[PDB]
């Protein structure tokens, strides 16, 4: 602590007086990861491996919740053509936890497959499928041209070119209504001032990249709108009380001391916030208990010494911290 005076002041010698040096550092011991016990894996193979799919104008939205996810086919193993994520880190998929997911299954040809991104402009990117700027999820594509193609072409899958205005995202168009430019009524069929928006895909194996069909499944993640029951295979440890430790509580991380809450709380409450809007209290995921969070490493270090021409003895002042409980 004589040389802690020389380190903070950036000087070779010591002047006589009292100098503020540093603060306490309390190292955490263990790490606590809490996730509830669910023996059911998530049905990710039902949306990927199914025989018949839907179109780009009307898709099949599969709500998947209250399970344990398997990300090893989407991260370590690569059966699939490309991995495109935007707001989520692909390595951190197994770390973070979300409530539910909405899978959108649609087949887009390889010329038009570059229009799937937030904030694009195109035929699919205006009148069919959009993404918002706050969208959270990933885009997974795979080449289907050895299976779903046909020599004469596959007209069973369909798409719609035309719409009167720009379509809002997360909305399916089920309307069979003929697009009417003028004042002539269509009466269900094409004609003068009546165009038919519904088209069929170009899919053949013999042609190039733009005729190759791709199976695109886009996942939509919902973060902190609800309690989070869905993430990867993370383990679980015991709760440690009266110790400064690292926290992982349902994806939320921190450092503190777990103490018992004496107040009356909501049964649906996941966590709660202080005057600074940080989490001071959180419900346990497996059993119903709410434990408070009291942070560690508080108080300063002040030294009192004579200078280098007098004596090397250093008196150390701990400010604000009781020394009955208790720098290298």
């Amino acid at each position: 602590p004589l040389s802690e005076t020389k380190c903070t002041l950036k000087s070779f010698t010591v002047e006589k007086g009292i100098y503020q040096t540093s603060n306490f550092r309390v190292q955490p011991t263990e790490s606590i990861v809490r996730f509830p016990n669910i023996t059911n894996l998530c049905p990710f193979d039902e949306v990927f491996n199914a025989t018949r799919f839907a179109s780009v104008y009307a898709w099949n939205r599969k709500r998947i919740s209250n399970c344990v996810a398997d990300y090893s086919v989407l991260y370590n193993l690569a059966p699939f053509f490309t991995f495109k994520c935007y707001g989520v880190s692909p390595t951190k998929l197994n770390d973070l936890c979300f409530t539910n997911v909405y899978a959108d299954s649609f087949v887009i040809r390889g010329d038009e497959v570059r229009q799937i991104a937030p904030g694009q402009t195109g035929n699919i990117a205006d009148y069919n499928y959009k993404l918002p700027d706050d969208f959270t999820g990933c885009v997974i594509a795979w080449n289907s041209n050895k299976l779903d193609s046909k020599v004469s072409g596959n007209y069973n899958y369909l798409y719609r070119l035309f719409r009167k205005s720009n379509l809002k995202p997360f909305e399916r168009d089920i309307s069979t209504e003929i697009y009417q430019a003028g004042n002539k009524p269509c009466n269900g069929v094409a004609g003068f001032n009546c165009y038919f928006p519904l088209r069929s895909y170009s899919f053949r194996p013999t042609y190039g990249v733009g005729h190759q069909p791709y199976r695109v499944v886009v996942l939509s993640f919902e973060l902190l709108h609800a309690p989070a029951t869905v993430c990867g295979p993370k383990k679980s440890t015991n709760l440690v009380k009266n110790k400064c430790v690292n926290f992982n509580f349902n994806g939320l991380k921190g450092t503190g001391v777990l103490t018992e809450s004496n107040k009356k709380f909501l049964p649906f409450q996941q966590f709660g916030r202080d005057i600074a809007d940080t989490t001071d209290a959180v419900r346990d995921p497996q059993t119903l208990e709410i434990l408070d969070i009291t942070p560690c490493s508080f108080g300063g270090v002040s030294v009192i010494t004579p200078g280098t021409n007098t004596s090397n003895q250093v008196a150390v002042l701990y400010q604000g911290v009781n020394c009955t409980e208790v720098p290298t």
């Binding site: 989520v88 880190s89 951190k92 770390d95 973070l96 939320l252 991380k253 921190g254 809007d277 940080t278």
Partner: protein, 49 residues
């Protein structure tokens, strides 16, 4: 930034993507201290006068 919690930035994003959003949150907390300590020098000058 998207969230003010520093555990909700670095653990939720790429390490190239975190260091843009962390350095916005540090510089906003440096400007909150540069409004504080400059106010403590002006208001103590009225006390010492």
């Amino acid at each position: 930034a998207i969230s003010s919690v520093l555990n909700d930035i670095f653990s939720r994003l790429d390490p190239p993507e975190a260091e843009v959003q962390i350095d916005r949150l540090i510089t906003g907390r440096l400007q909150s201290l540069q409004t504080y300590v400059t106010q403590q020098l002006i208001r103590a000058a009225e006390i010492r006068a």
